[PDB]
Design a protein around this ligand. Structure first.
Ligand code: DGD
Ligand code: CLA
Ligand code: CLA
Ligand code: CLA
Ligand code: CLA
Ligand code: CLA
Ligand code: CLA
Ligand code: CLA
Ligand code: CLA
Ligand code: BCR
Ligand code: SF4
Ligand code: CA
Lengths: 74, 144, 80, 165, 74, 39, 63, 733
């Protein structure tokens, strides 16, 4: 369930597709917060026209190593 | 019933030795010796660590404190249903029988035992420490 | 040595004697309860103060009390 | 006004802080497009900031030298200068909800204490009884005052255990 | 904790860094060999110096980390 | 079904549902009424 | 016939008792001259997990 | 065999383990627990101990005077007390290298010295000391006084000089002599010194033992005192242009009540202090004639206590029997004395920073900070001791039969209500103070500082306005120009006091805001929680539901075993033990608040504190991280400076604190088993088994472990904060 959640977050609330075209400048992000009580500030400018929390789990690099290029596969 | 006498020439259980045995206290202060009778050869656990084999018949062992002897007594009584007994030996050679003191185990009442350290009152009836103050030394109200 | 005291609220259940790990307590005849027995402490010089007897006592409040007193080789449970 | 403070509608530091917040939000927005999700989210945050500042100034809050609103806890000053909405009305609101919760819980404990196994009802909550008591707890101040006046709110000293002193 | 502290300081001091013209500039400037031999060096150059990013993170996207940094002390 | 409802009536499940309801109510109030500081 | 009736509720008057000023059910009363003939059972256990105790005739009151 | 040490305990002397030495050292002053101790012998031993303590105090004072006179710069500091740092003593350490030698060589000395932070320079300068000869003479005099006190202590133990038990119980005579002689006459003598030496020395006139009999303190010479024209002593005071130590701008008055501070020294007027001591001397002397001793007139404290019971019976028997339970219990008297002394120590700290009495003390920021922190920590420790002795009184000296129905018995009658209400107050304060802090932290983190809750302290600001501060604008009492209270003091002391309180450059009633409100609530939480632990431990000292016979085990015992659910830390000693941590936390909060507010004040930016004290991140970054930069840079790979000793002390305190956590977390059993393995290793090692121990090695007891862990915790706490405070305040200024 946890792994499926990681793949779902990388497929619907991430910037993996944009990060593929520029992995040296775009920060990996796979978590977005809802705009409530002023917490939207946590959705930082990670690059690629995306706003979210910079993840450090390394799922982007693992997916790139496996040959995943689209959100449909995730 | 009569008080038994320690037999120093009694075979000991088969044990290869350990580092949890006797120390200088046995040679300078005192030590304890436990003896028991076994119906057959059986492997038991030593209170100081390890597994020993008690032989058929008399068995003698030495320990540094009385708690080790009573722990072995409890193990032999509850598991193998034996009746062990121990003594306190001094470096001069004096032997003092310890348990069972009157030949009967203390858990069961036996005639001839005189009660000691018994207060004919309850805890709530104890006096305050102020009435015990300025005594010979630190005394609790329960001691009177 | 520690001070072990028995009180008259004892019911003679012999649970404190069975729980003593150094043979300090025993049972003596008595007439103040149904069991006709009472706990006793005739070997307090060997008491270490573990208070297992107090843990095994079912009366409220306890019928056996252990007050930590002077410390010696036996009371400290030293094998050296 | 009170304690040498000035109203937030006239404080220069208040407007300066509003301009600073809008400036950093606009600076972050300058790096995105004009019809994208981050642009819409940043614009929504900017509108929320403007509305919050206007609402705080409209409420009549007092701002200090730092430009931040300051609350008045004294009932006399709050009722004399129109600051009862800061600390007075929320005080009574919390008292009502807190006493509501406490009264409902006390009623549930008293109700399940007369059963066969009250502890079982304490671990496994009786939902119908709890819901009925939760709905009936709206009149907790009146019921509490009546219980206090009848002498049934407290327990006698002889029925409460104490230490041997 | 001492293991991860050593890893972080060693990587930021002698491995990680940017590449410039005829030279490599590290994150901390190679101060591990000169300051990791004293407890004062670990407290000042590693704990006091590197904690600046988490204490002044308020008002940005990493502010949450700062909040947790305080919550974890609690 | 009776046993399932009794299980749902236990303290952790009831606490979870109640706290989810209370948190949702507070979140929705703060969503429709953003930044409430004074009455 | 001495002591409280079996099955009745009494209040403990022993100060050092855990159930002091608490109500307990009477189980049995000894007919001999023992110090504590009344046997009282309680619904709440003490710190030792015990729910019964022995009390004297003057240590319990019908409450 | 039986050892000689300890001679006061036969049971401890028969102990064959290392516990004998530790317990003999920790039970040396517990005279009530000694073998064959009586009441008369107890009082005699306490009398001798008191004399020895006075001897130590006087010797310590003489040592400070001698070192300042020998290795200090007092003769140069009096010339320029604004730009010259005081010198404590010289440094002679063979471990110092060359850079450390030139680093500590400062302050005009010829070698490495220590810059004093105790403030004895300002105090001695204000009271009249000018040269090193004066300090040398004072040091010799105090050494002689110390030797005399030590001889008195030895003499009162020999036969024909031991006081009887009845002499020690003469409460009326002792109280009369302490109020009239120890307090009133001493204050009158201090007034004589201020009028005769301090005041003329502050006006450039030298008055010493060689000419004080030929120099008049006032030009009218005792005539106005005898004729009743006392107002003649307040005529012609020091003007606003008076230079301390010189005759320029000096006056002739000796007893004034101008109020406020001196325009140059920023301290209280010497004439005002002299007049203060004279008034309190008269009051204390008059109060010293209240009790009946040997002339029929006076009171009997037993009669006043017995005749003070309310008629409705709200207080039961009232104070009947309270005279005997206090006079016959030394722990009750010790607890009362420690409670009053702790409160007075706190009062000293507050009044000393707000109203500086010594010349050029407010400019010395390090001295002010160190003095305030020192007195507050001393006060906290003394308060904890007062409550601990109250618990000891309940266990060892309280008699329910003698105190039947009085207020003392009624306190234990409703102790559950007191503990429960203390718990409720502490819970409310903690929940709300922490909630407001976390809310402000979240608002500052999300970039919305206008959304944090900032409650203005209108009550304290209202009090400040009542004292004369017109910043808030309340305009009432001393703040209003048309009030009776204002007009009645405009000719005596209100001008100077108003000018000083309306000045924002001093510490006299500093401006407060929401940050002050929040930290004051944190202080209230600390006080209430420490009080809850101490009060609960004193009331439950005689027993509880878990241990109905706790009084039969003494004040300090390990536990009651793992039975009945577990009884760890059940004694009253353990309650005091847990309360010491809360006391350290409370004093830490008050000293943190004091240091940060004063640091921002001295730096000229109070807005920094006003805007960063409302959230905990501001406290951690703008106060702890920002002010420790110079401290941790005392020694670095590029060299070192004079501030390296504070950096070493900082790390030293951290190490001691962490070492305390070991005795605090790990318990006896593990260590005892480890020690047994070590015993076997030593007994089975050749060339080493020939050397045997005299005491059997055993692990530290549970109570000893708690005491050792708390001692390390407190030592590390104190040393760490002292090093940080002194280094930050001295380096910044
Ligand atoms: C500058 C001045 C000081 C200088 C110090 C210099 C060097 C350091 C010296 C010594 C170091 C510590 C040595 C003792 C360690 C503890 C050993 C101990 O025996 O420990 C146990 C002792 C002894 O307890 C007694 O133990 C007794 C043991 O009796 C037993 O044994 C008896 C004798 O046989 C009897 O038989 C008796 O029946 C039996 O029960 C009893 O139980 C008593 O009731 C009980 O009180 O307890 C105690 O704690 C007694 C101590 C009370 C301390 C109270 C204050 C605590 C303050 C803490 C915070 C400190 C902060 C420092 C700040 C610094 C900032 C810079
Ligand atoms: C296993 C790890 C995991 C974690 C840690 C998260 C975490 C998160 N998810 Mg995600 N997700 C996961 C797996 C995970 N997900 C998987 C496997 C899927 C595919 C099905 C998804 C699909 C998904 C979607 C579509 C969305 C999220 C969203 C979110 C975020 C909003 C939190 C939320 O739930 O709001 C809602 C909170 C509640 C509904 C409250 C629930 C409380 C209930 C009532 C408790 C009941 C207790 C009961 C006994 C247990 C339930 C059992 C029941 C299901 C039978 C959050 C950070 C949202 C988001 O990212 O926002 C942009 C979003 O829209 N997730
Ligand atoms: C929790 C403690 C607390 C504290 C520390 C204060 C403190 C204060 N209150 Mg107060 N108050 C409290 C609780 C408290 N109140 C509660 C629970 C109530 C509800 C009953 C009130 C209702 C109240 C009123 C209606 C007023 C104050 C006022 C005041 C201020 C001055 C009066 C005073 O000191 O006497 C203590 C307060 C009282 C005994 C309440 C009665 C008010 C007295 C009689 C003074 C009023 C006369 C006049 C207005 C004084 C100002 C003169 C001039 C400057 C206008 C003062 C700072 C006065 C004020 O400054 O108005 C802005 C004011 O009129 N309070
Ligand atoms: C029926 C619920 C209930 C009620 C009416 C009370 C009432 C009271 N408590 Mg208490 N408490 C409770 C539950 C409750 N508590 C629980 C569950 C705990 C364990 C966390 C505590 C722990 C506690 C402590 C440590 C203290 C009090 C104290 C007090 C008194 C001071 C007021 C206060 O709010 O303190 C604060 C109370 C709390 C912070 C805990 C409240 C917990 C929630 C809000 C209660 C909800 C219970 C339940 C889930 C709801 C009923 C469900 C039912 C319908 C099925 C007061 C009479 C103080 C005291 O001794 O009196 C002077 C005090 O020191 N309480
Ligand atoms: C006890 C401490 C405490 C207090 C007094 C407050 C108080 C407040 N907080 Mg805060 N907060 C706290 C702790 C605290 N917080 C902590 C510990 C955190 C970290 C988790 C936060 C994090 C936090 C955030 C992120 C936010 C707040 C916000 C708020 C404000 C919202 C008011 C509201 O909910 O609308 C009104 C609520 C109701 C009308 C509910 C009424 C209940 C029923 C339905 C009606 C019955 C009444 C009769 C309010 C003034 C919000 C804000 O805007 O700040 C100004 C917000 O953004 N808080
Ligand atoms: C006028 C006669 C007189 C005088 C002067 C004294 C004086 C003293 N007696 Mg004594 N006594 C007397 C009569 C007298 N007694 C009589 C008649 C009896 C028999 C009934 C006793 C029975 C007696 C006993 C049993 C004891 C004493 C003790 C003491 C000493 C207390 C030690 C102390 O606390 O320091 C001095 C205290 C002060 C100077 C008061 C300080 C005022 C506050 C607390 C401080 C504020 C001052 C100021 C702000 C701080 C200065 C600032 C700066 C200088 C640092 C003290 C020197 C104790 C002792 O023996 O010690 C050896 C003691 O045990 N007396
Ligand atoms: C006028 C002040 C005063 C006086 C006369 C007493 C007198 C007494 N106290 Mg008491 N107490 C006081 C204040 C005072 N106390 C204060 C301020 C506290 C709070 C700290 C306490 C807390 C306290 C407790 C908890 C207990 C006593 C006990 C006792 C009694 C005997 C214990 C004893 O002293 O043996 C000797 C004392 C010691 C050997 C102290 C050990 C050394 C300490 C920890 C200092 C360590 C500092 C460290 C070395 C610093 C090094 C740093 C450097 C190397 C870097 C005795 C009658 C005990 C008692 O009544 O017995 C039942 C008891 O348990 N006191
Ligand atoms: C930062 C450390 C810390 C904290 C927070 C506390 C907190 C507290 N101590 Mg304590 N103490 C400490 C260290 C600490 N102590 C240490 C080192 C010692 C020495 C051993 C002591 C010794 C001590 C004693 C002896 C006593 C206390 C008492 C108390 C309570 C005082 C009442 C209060 O202020 O209410 C406020 C409550 C809090 C501050 C708790 C925090 C509330 C949290 C943050 C809210 C819940 C978070 C969220 C909603 C849910 C998260 C859970 C998650 C798993 C889902 C309080 C809970 C006294 C007491 O019990 O009072 C009755 C008491 O007698 N303390
Ligand atoms: C910083 C605090 C601190 C310190 C200094 C120690 C130190 C020690 N711990 Mg320990 N521990 C701590 C915290 C600490 N612990 C805490 C908080 C816990 C609770 C979780 C534990 C739990 C714990 C356990 C369970 C064990 C230890 C053990 C040990 C010992 C390991 C042997 C060793 O390191 O050799 C050398 C000693 C040191 C490095 C300590 C510093 C010595 C300095 C550098 C030397 C100074 C000498 C100097 C010249 C002295 C002159 C003084 C002068 C006045 C004369 C050692 C003495 C283990 C042990 O028993 O030993 C095998 C063990 O089993 N600790
Ligand atoms: C346990 C115990 C005890 C106790 C202790 C204690 C008690 C502590 C505490 C505490 C404290 C520490 C206290 C204190 C206090 C204080 C008070 C009570 C006060 C006050 C006040 C007033 C009255 C004031 C007034 C005024 C003002 C307001 C300002 C201006 C001036 C005037 C004067 C006007 C003892 C030992 C005895 C013994 C027994 C046991
Ligand atoms: S456990 Fe208690 S009741 Fe039972 S025999 Fe021992 S002392 Fe008596
Ligand atoms: Ca002179």
């Amino acid at each position: 369930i946890w792994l499926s959640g990681m793949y779902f977050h990388g497929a619907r609330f991430s910037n993996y597709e944009a990060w593929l075209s520029d992995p040296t400048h775009i920060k990996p992000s796979a978590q977005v917060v809802w705009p409530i009580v002023g917490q939207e500030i946590l959705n930082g400018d990670v690059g690629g026209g995306f706003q979210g929390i910079q993840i450090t789990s390394g799922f982007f690099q693992l997916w790139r190593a496996s040959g995943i290029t689209s959100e449909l596969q995730l | 019933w009569t008080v038994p006498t320690l037999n120093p020439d009694t075979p000991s259980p088969i044990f290869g030795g350990s580092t949890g045995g006797l120390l200088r206290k046995a040679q300078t202060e005192e030590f304890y010796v436990i003896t028991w009778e076994a119906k057959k050869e059986q492997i038991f656990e030593m209170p100081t660590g390890g597994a020993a084999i008690m032989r058929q018949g008399p068995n003698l062992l030495k320990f540094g404190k009385k708690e080790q002897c009573l722990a072995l007594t409890t193990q032999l009584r509850n598991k193998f249903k034996l009746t062990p007994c121990f003594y306190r030996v001094f470096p001069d050679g004096k032997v003092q029988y310890l348990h069972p003191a009157d030949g009967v185990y203390p858990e069961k009442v036996n005639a001839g035992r005189v009660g000691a350290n018994q207060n004919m009152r309850r805890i709530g009836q104890n006096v305050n420490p102020i009435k015990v103050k300025f005594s010979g030394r630190m005394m609790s109200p329960a001691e009177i | 040595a520690h001070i072990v005291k028995i009180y008259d609220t004892c019911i003679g259940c012999t649970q404190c004697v069975r729980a003593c790990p150094l043979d300090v307590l025993e049972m003596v005849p008595w007439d103040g309860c149904k069991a006709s027995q009472m706990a006793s402490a005739p070997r307090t010089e060997d008491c270490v103060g573990c208070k297992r007897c107090e843990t095994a006592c079912p009366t409220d409040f306890l019928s056996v009390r252990v007050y930590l007193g002077s410390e010696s080789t036996r009371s400290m449970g030293l094998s050296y | 006004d009170i304690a040498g403070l000035t109203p937030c509608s006239e404080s220069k530091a208040y407007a300066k802080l509003e301009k600073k917040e809008l400036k950093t939000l606009e600076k972050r927005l300058k790096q995105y497009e004009a019809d994208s999700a981050p642009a819409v989210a940043l614009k929504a945050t900017m509108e929320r900031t403007k509305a919050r500042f206007a609402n705080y100034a409209k409420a009549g809050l007092l701002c200090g030298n730092d430009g931040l609103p300051h609350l008045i806890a004294d009932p006399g000053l709050a009722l004399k200068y129109g600051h009862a909405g800061e600390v007075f009305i929320p005080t009574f609101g919390f008292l009502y909800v807190a006493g509501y919760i406490g009264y409902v819980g006390r009623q549930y404990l008293i109700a399940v204490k007369g059963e066969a196994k009250p502890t079982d009802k304490e671990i496994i909550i009786d939902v119908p009884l709890a819901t009925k008591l939760a709905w009936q707890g709206a009149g907790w101040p009146l019921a509490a005052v009546q219980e206090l006046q009848r002498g049934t709110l407290l327990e006698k000293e002889e029925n409460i255990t104490v230490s041997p002193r | 904790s001492i293991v991860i502290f050593h890893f972080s300081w060693k990587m930021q001091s002698d491995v990680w860094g940017t590449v410039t013209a005829s030279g490599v500039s590290h994150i901390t400037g190679g101060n591990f060999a000169q300051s990791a031999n004293t407890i004062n060096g670990w407290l000042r150059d590693f704990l006091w110096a590197q904690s600046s990013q988490v204490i002044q993170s308020y008002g940005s996207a990493l502010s949450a980390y700062g909040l947790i940094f305080l919550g974890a002390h609690f | 079904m009776k046993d399932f409802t009794t299980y749902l009536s236990t303290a952790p499940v009831i606490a979870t549902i109640w706290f989810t309801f209370t948190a949702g109510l507070l979140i929705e109030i703060n969503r429709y009424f953003p930044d409430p500081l004074v009455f | 016939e001495v002591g409280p009736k079996r099955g009745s509720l009494v209040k403990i008057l022993r100060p050092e008792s855990y159930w002091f000023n608490q109500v307990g059910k009477v189980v049995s009363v000894d007919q001999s001259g023992v110090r504590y003939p009344v046997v009282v059972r309680f619904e709440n256990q003490n710190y030792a997990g015990v729910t019964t105790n022995n009390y004297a005739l003057d240590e319990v009151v019908a409450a | 065999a039986t050892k000689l040490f300890p001679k006061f305990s036969q049971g401890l002397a028969q102990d064959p383990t290392t516990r004998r030495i530790w317990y003999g050292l920790a039970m040396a002053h517990d005279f009530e627990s000694h073998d064959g101790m009586t009441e008369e012998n107890l009082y005699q031993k306490i009398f001798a101990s008191h004399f020895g303590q006075l001897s130590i105090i006087f010797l310590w004072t003489s040592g400070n005077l001698f070192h300042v006179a020998w290795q200090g710069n007092f003769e140069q500091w009096v010339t320029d007390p604004v730009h010259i740092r005081p010198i404590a003593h010289a440094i002679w350490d063979p471990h110092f290298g060359q850079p450390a030698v030139e680093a500590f060589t400062r302050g005009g000395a010829s070698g490495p010295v220590n810059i004093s932070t105790s403030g004895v320079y300002q105090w001695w300068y204000t009271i009249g000391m000018r040269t090193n000869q004066d300090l040398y003479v004072g040091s010799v005099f105090l050494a002689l006084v110390s030797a005399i006190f030590l001889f008195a202590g030895w003499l009162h133990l020999q036969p024909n000089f031991q006081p009887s038990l009845s002499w020690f119980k003469d409460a009326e005579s002792r109280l009369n002599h302490h109020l009239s002689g120890l307090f009133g006459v001493s204050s009158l003598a201090w007034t004589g010194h201020l009028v005769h030496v301090a005041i003329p020395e502050s006006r450039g006139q030298h008055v010493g033992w060689d000419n004080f009999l030929s120099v008049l303190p006032h030009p009218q010479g005792l005539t106005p005192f005898f004729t009743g024209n006392w107002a003649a002593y307040a005529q012609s005071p020091d003007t606003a242009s008076h230079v301390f130590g010189t005759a320029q701008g000096s006056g002739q008055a000796i007893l004034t009540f101008l109020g406020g501070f001196h325009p140059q020294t920023q301290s209280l007027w010497l004439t005002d202090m002299a007049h203060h001591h004279l008034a309190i001397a008269v009051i204390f002397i008059v109060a010293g004639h209240m009790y009946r001793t040997n002339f029929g007139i006076g009171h009997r404290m037993q009669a006043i206590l017995e005749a003070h019971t309310p008629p409705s019976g709200s207080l039961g028997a009232g104070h009947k029997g309270l005279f005997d339970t206090v006079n016959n219990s030394l722990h009750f008297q010790l607890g009362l004395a420690l409670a009053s002394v702790g409160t007075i120590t706190s009062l000293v700290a507050q009044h000393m920073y707000s109203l500086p009495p010594y010349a050029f003390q407010a400019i010395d920021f390090t001295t002010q900070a160190a003095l305030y922190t020192h007195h507050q920590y001393i006060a906290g420790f003394i308060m904890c001791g007062a409550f601990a002795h109250g618990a000891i009184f309940f266990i060892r000296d309280y008699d329910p039969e003698q105190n039947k129905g009085n207020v003392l018995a009624r306190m234990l009658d409703h102790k559950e209500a007191l503990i429960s209400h203390l718990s409720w107050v502490s819970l409310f304060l903690g929940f709300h103070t922490l909630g407001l802090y976390v809310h402000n932290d979240v608002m500052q983190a999300f970039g919305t500082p206008e959304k944090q809750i900032l409650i203005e302290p209108v009550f304290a600001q209202w009090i400040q306005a009542a004292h004369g501060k017109a910043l808030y604008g309340f305009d009432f009492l001393l703040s209003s120009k048309t009030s009776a209270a204002f007009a009645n003091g405009q000719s005596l002391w209100l001008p100077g006091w108003l000018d000083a309180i309306n000045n924002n450059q001093n510490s006299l009633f500093l401006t407060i805001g929401p940050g002050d409100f929040l930290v004051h609530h944190a202080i209230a939480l600390g006080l209430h929680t420490t009080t809850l632990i101490l009060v609960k431990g004193a009331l439950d000292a005689r027993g509880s539901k878990l241990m109905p016979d706790k009084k039969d085990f003494g004040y300090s015992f390990p536990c009651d075993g793992p039975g009945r659910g577990g009884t760890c830390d059940i004694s009253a000693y353990d309650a005091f033990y847990l309360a010491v941590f809360w006391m350290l936390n409370t004093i830490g909060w008050v000293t943190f608040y004091w240091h940060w507010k004063h640091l921002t004040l001295w730096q000229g930016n109070v807005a920094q504190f006003d805007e960063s004290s409302t959230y905990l991140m501001g406290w951690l970054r703008d106060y702890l991280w920002l002010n420790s930069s110079q401290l941790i840079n005392g020694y670095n790979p590029f060299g070192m400076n004079s501030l390296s000793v504070w950096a070493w002390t900082f790390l030293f305190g951290h190490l001691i604190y962490a070492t305390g956590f070991m005795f605090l977390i790990s318990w006896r059993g593990y260590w005892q088993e480890l020690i047994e393995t070590l015993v076997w290793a030593h007994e089975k090692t050749p060339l080493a088994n020939l050397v045997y121990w005299k005491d059997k090695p055993v692990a530290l007891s549970i109570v000893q472990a708690r005491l050792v862990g708390l001692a390390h915790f407190s030592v590390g706490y104190i040393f760490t904060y002292a090093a940080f405070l002194i280094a930050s305040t001295s380096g910044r200024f």
